[PDB]
Amino acid sequence: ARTVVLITGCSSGIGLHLAVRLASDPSQSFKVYATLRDLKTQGRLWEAARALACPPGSLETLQLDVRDSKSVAAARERVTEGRVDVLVCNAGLGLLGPLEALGEDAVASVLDVNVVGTVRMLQAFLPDMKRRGSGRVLVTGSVGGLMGLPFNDVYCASKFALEGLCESLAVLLLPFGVHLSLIECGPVHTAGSPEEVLDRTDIHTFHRFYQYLAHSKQVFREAAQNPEEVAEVFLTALRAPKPTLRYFTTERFLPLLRMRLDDPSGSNYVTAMHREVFG
Amino acid sequence: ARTVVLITGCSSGIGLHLAVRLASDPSQSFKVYATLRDLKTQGRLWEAARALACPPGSLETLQLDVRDSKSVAAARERVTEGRVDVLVCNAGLGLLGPLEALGEDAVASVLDVNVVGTVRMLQAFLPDMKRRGSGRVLVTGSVGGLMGLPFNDVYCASKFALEGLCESLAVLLLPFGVHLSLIECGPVHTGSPEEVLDRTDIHTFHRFYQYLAHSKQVFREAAQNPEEVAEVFLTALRAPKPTLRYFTTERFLPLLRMRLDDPSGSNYVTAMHREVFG
């Protein structure tokens, strides 16, 4: 029997490369259901699958809207095997800019996808795992879920939310034999405008926004990992006989994380992060 | 010139007691706009204010529903002084139960109130503070925003989210002269079995009973008076160099340390499972 894996958000980046990595593994032990919001974006996926010689029946695509629990329920029912051994919740959205420049619609959508979308997935798939006494849930995390990042207030909110969600569930799921883990990524190199931002906020906040964006570019140049490397961490977690709640894909944000975790008042972190970003 | 304070969720609990504490302060330095979702619930607030002899004009009430940016905007227009010196984001919702037993609208509602509610408030009042170069934001946090609690999966997600929102903002607001702090509270003193059993498995149902039993006992041991919590808001409010996080109690600090000492989460999960379920 193959290990049946369902992965959300497979049109690009981590989900794309994880799907083809598992499907093309020399062992032939994985059957991957790769989900996508829009079927028209599936070409990159199929090209990658072809180039990696994924064997027949190792990779299937499904349409999946994580905002719609009927779409989630229909994806569950397409799993012909009647189980999911590994669930990877990876579909997510970013939102970058001054808080007072963000549309309420955009805030609500980022929450609905990143947080409520993950809830919907766990609601649909955890019951069969709990009754079976087995199953693995892997959640794409971020360094932005571990520490606050300026101009990513709502993004960090959504990723911090997953930390809380997963940790709460993990406490309960321990004796069920169902294992949940976050994969904490730093910057990843994958494949609204500045004018509206400036129109919705003060000229000085915009300058702070520019400075943040310049620091972030430099962080990416020093530290960006690719999706192939991140995929290997998902593999490590899914193979571990006794997985931990968090895996770190990189060691590079650990000095900052220590500053945060060694001063619960948050004073050391806020000053240090302010210095890191704005000099 | 008085310190102008606007507080959300003042019909009871922390918001009520903080409003009356500031309004009745012997210094008389606070002008308090206490806001409530429905003004028809304002009785206990005003009865408390009268029992503490809050002077005329120390306290006003406004209707403010944090779920609606039109209501937030209209409340902002009522602040006659044309500034808020202290914004207290306090209105919040709980949600308790098996994840798979929770309705989608309840989940959406907790996030909308606890997270987007605070976003709405900050969007309305932060711009004037940033361009004045002064202002204090105080936000009601929870031990549930600092560590995951079983059967509070969505509640904890919403309080963790607040932590991330506020921390991100604090980093940016540092040079603008605007200071943001979270007030981390323990529990505060302020569906049928068959229906829950229908929506989950027998083993989860049993763990839920156990968590409810343990929680009853933590509450007797540890629940705080809202007066104490309000007093910690005032401590933070008057701090010369305010920090990001204040704790209202020492009780949960051992569990928190154990969480912070092991980033892998292995120590916390096992320890919290033992605390709750034996």
UniProtKB/Swiss-Prot annotation, chain B:
It catalyses: 17beta-estradiol + NAD(+) = estrone + NADH + H(+); 17beta-estradiol + NADP(+) = estrone + NADPH + H(+); testosterone + NADP(+) = androst-4-ene-3,17-dione + NADPH + H(+). The active site is at Y155. Pfam families: adh_short. GO terms for molecular function: 17-beta-hydroxysteroid dehydrogenase (NADP+) activity; catalytic activity; estradiol 17-beta-dehydrogenase [NAD(P)+] activity; estradiol binding; NADP binding; NADP+ binding; protein homodimerization activity; small molecule binding. GO terms for biological process: adipose tissue development; bone development; cellular response to metal ion; estrogen biosynthetic process; estrogen metabolic process; gene expression; lysosome organization; skeletal muscle tissue development. Pathway: Steroid biosynthesis; estrogen biosynthesis. Favors the reduction of estrogens and androgens. Converts estrone (E1) to a more potent estrogen, 17beta-estradiol (E2). Also has 20-alpha-HSD activity. Uses preferentially NADH. Belongs to the short-chain dehydrogenases/reductases (SDR) family. Homodimer. Exists predominantly as a homodimer but also exits as monomer. This is 17-beta-hydroxysteroid dehydrogenase type 1. It comes from Homo sapiens (Human).
